Design a protein around this motif. Structure first.
Motif, short mmCIF file in Angstrom:
data_model
loop_
_atom_site.label_atom_id
_atom_site.label_comp_id
_atom_site.label_asym_id
_atom_site.label_seq_id
_atom_site.Cartn_x
_atom_site.Cartn_y
_atom_site.Cartn_z
N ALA A 274 0.56 -1.00 -0.46
CA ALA A 274 -0.27 0.32 -0.10
C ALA A 274 1.09 1.16 -0.21
N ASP A 275 2.18 0.94 0.75
CA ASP A 275 3.21 2.60 0.35
C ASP A 275 3.87 2.12 -0.64
N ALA A 276 3.45 1.55 -1.23
CA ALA A 276 4.54 1.70 -3.02
C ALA A 276 3.29 2.25 -3.90
N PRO A 277 4.70 3.41 -4.83
CA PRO A 277 3.99 4.68 -5.80
C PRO A 277 3.40 3.82 -6.44
N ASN A 278 1.94 4.07 -7.00
CA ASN A 278 1.16 3.59 -8.38
C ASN A 278 2.36 3.90 -9.76
N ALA A 279 1.89 2.77 -10.07
CA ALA A 279 2.95 3.11 -11.77
C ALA A 279 1.91 2.84 -12.52
N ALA A 280 2.14 3.29 -13.58
CA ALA A 280 1.17 4.28 -14.99
C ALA A 280 2.49 4.72 -16.00
N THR A 281 3.25 3.60 -16.90
CA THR A 281 4.24 4.60 -17.36
C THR A 281 4.02 5.31 -18.67
N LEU A 282 4.31 6.73 -18.85
CA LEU A 282 3.78 7.14 -19.98
C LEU A 282 4.29 6.97 -21.50
N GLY A 283 2.84 6.94 -21.41
CA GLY A 283 3.21 6.55 -23.36
C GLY A 283 2.47 8.43 -23.91
N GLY A 284 2.60 8.09 -25.11
CA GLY A 284 2.00 9.22 -26.09
C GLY A 284 2.34 9.54 -27.28
N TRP A 285 2.11 10.07 -28.21
CA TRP A 285 2.25 10.50 -29.62
C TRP A 285 2.32 11.88 -29.49
N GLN A 286 3.28 12.65 -30.36
CA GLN A 286 3.54 13.81 -30.71
C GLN A 286 3.24 13.86 -32.27
N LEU A 287 2.97 15.15 -32.30
CA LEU A 287 3.28 15.72 -34.53
C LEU A 287 4.40 16.49 -34.56
N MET A 288 4.95 16.12 -35.29
CA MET A 288 6.57 16.49 -35.64
C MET A 288 6.29 16.85 -37.28
N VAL A 289 6.44 18.35 -37.50
CA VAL A 289 6.83 18.96 -39.15
C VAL A 289 8.89 18.68 -38.98
N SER A 290 8.42 17.87 -40.28
CA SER A 290 9.75 18.22 -41.11
C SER A 290 10.59 18.85 -41.08
N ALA A 291 11.64 18.83 -40.72
CA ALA A 291 12.93 20.48 -40.63
C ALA A 291 13.39 20.43 -42.90
N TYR A 292 12.66 18.62 -42.98
CA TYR A 292 13.24 18.60 -44.24
C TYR A 292 12.03 18.70 -44.96
N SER A 293 10.79 19.08 -44.43
CA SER A 293 9.65 19.19 -45.63
C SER A 293 9.62 19.86 -46.72
N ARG A 294 9.43 20.27 -47.30
CA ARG A 294 9.27 21.49 -48.73
C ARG A 294 7.90 22.59 -47.78
#
Ligand SMILES: OC[C@H]1O[C@H](O)[C@H](O)[C@@H](O)[C@@H]1O
Ligand SMILES: OCCCCC[C@H](O)CO
Length: 404
Positions: A274-294
């Motif tokens: 009961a005194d351990a911490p709850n664990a839920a690994t953070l995930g998720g996805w982001q949107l990147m514009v390419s530095a190489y996009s025309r």
């Protein structure tokens, strides 16, 4: 006119790739812009290697990429800085933690799109059948429930039935599962945010030995080859009491024709005591514009559309994927469809991150050491004591001379 080309998500995991293509096509139709969708492999680490081919080539053949939460430190050179395109007010509509994650040396690499946290899926019909009134809060309870329900279901004739399924394949998903085991035993974060490599301790070793104890017992022997969808398939056919997985599996399990529709709930993962911490690994996805996009202007416009309220709402409602906009957690339609978004918001807020901030561009090397050493415990090749010692040594080599 320009063709705006998107690599993100995979048709090999749930409905993500199909939905993503749909949203990109919708933007193209609304704006009168040609678009093309490039599919990706299921596993994040395989996607990283694929996209690194395009980045090494400075390729203009992809304008927008969907990038993992663990990637900004690796991918920053290949990202257009988004900071100039958003007002402070617009940026504050997203969770500040995720905006901070996506900002590397002051460059906003990507807009938050959906977040993620590991959770426990459970068959409420089966818990009721075997006289349990709540899902397990401790790992020992999980194992007790799993043993008893399996014994009963096997005796009643379901030879396909297991107690627990999870991601035990040697890939990034195992680092996620393993961080949950370790952190929920009080064993720390593997590499702490300050840089301390903390994993060589008895609580981390116990957590890995406990997981080994599941393999071929309450979990299939084949769990050591399961990614997200392999686990989901056993679970969704009705053949597991418990599953560790991400939010996307909920909507899939509630779909018409799912064998388990209406038969399950979700809660926080168990912990050692009961005194351990709850664990839920953070995930998720982001949107990147390419530095190489025309076409940076057009690509930014697409990324702001995909990250918008209404598109994130559709992702929440239809795909049970977690918004990166706090306002969507109070939206009536989001909540009516997914009431557990409210119940587990504090779990999502307190999700534990993998050591991608501290490892930076060396994160994928660190992770490969983690999943390989963990996998050796799951298969019974090494004990957790030895594995954490060996992991410590590997990570020290990997991160030697890496600062901040
Ligand atoms: O398999 C691991 C991956 O699972 C999900 O896609 C998570 O969103 C991602 O952050 C994680 O790296
Ligand atoms: O699809 C876009 C959603 C706008 C909905 C706001 C709503 O009035 C919340 O109840």
């Amino acid at each position: 006119g320009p063709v705006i080309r998107v690599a993100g998500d995979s048709t090999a995991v749930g409905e993500g790739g199909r939905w993503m293509k749909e949203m990109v096509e919708a933007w193209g139709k609304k704006t009168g812009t040609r678009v093309e969708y490039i599919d990706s492999p299921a596993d994040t680490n395989d996607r990283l290697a694929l996209y690194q081919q395009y980045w090494a080539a400075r390729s203009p053949d992809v304008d927008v990429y969907m990038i993992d939460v663990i990637w900004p430190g690796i991918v920053a050179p290949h990202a257009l800085d988004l900071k100039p395109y958003l007002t402070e007010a617009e940026l504050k509509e997203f969770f500040p933690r995720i905006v901070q994650n996506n900002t590397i040396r002051g460059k906003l690499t990507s807009l938050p799109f959906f977040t993620d946290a590991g959770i426990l899926y459970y068959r409420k019909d089966l818990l009721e059948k075997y006289g349990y009134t709540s899902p397990p809060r401790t790992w020992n309870e999980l194992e007790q429930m799993a043993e008893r329900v399996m014994e009963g279901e096997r005796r009643a004739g379901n030879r396909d039935f297991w107690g627990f399924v999870f991601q035990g394949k040697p890939y990034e998903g195992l680092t996620c599962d393993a961080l949950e085991w370790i952190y929920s035993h009080g064993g720390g974060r593997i590499v702490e945010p300050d840089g301390t490599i903390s994993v060589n301790n008895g609580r981390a070793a116990l957590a890995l030995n406990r997981a080994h104890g599941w393999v071929g017992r309450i979990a299939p022997q084949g769990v050591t080859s399961y990614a997200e969808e392999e686990a989901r398939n056993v679970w969704q056919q009705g053949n597991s009491l418990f599953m560790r997985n991400w939010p996307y599996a909920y909507a899939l399990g509630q779909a018409e024709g799912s064998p388990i529709r209406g038969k399950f709930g979700v809660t926080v993962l168990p912990k050692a005591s009961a005194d351990a911490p709850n664990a839920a690994t953070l995930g998720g996805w982001q949107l990147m514009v390419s530095a190489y996009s025309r076409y940076p202007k057009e690509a930014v416009d697409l990324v702001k559309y995909l990250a918008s309220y209404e598109v994130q709402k559709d992702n929440a409602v239809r795909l049970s994927r977690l918004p990166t906009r706090p306002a969507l957690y109070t939206d009536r339609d989001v909540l009516a469809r997914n009431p557990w978004f409210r119940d587990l918001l504090p779990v999502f807020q307190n999700a534990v991150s993998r050591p991608s901030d501290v490892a930076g561009a060396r994160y994928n090397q660190v992770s490969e050491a983690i999943w390989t050493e963990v996998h050796s415990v799951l298969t019974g090749r090494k004990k957790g004591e030895q594995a954490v010692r060996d992991l410590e040594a590997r990570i020290r080599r990997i991160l030697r001379h890496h600062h901040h």
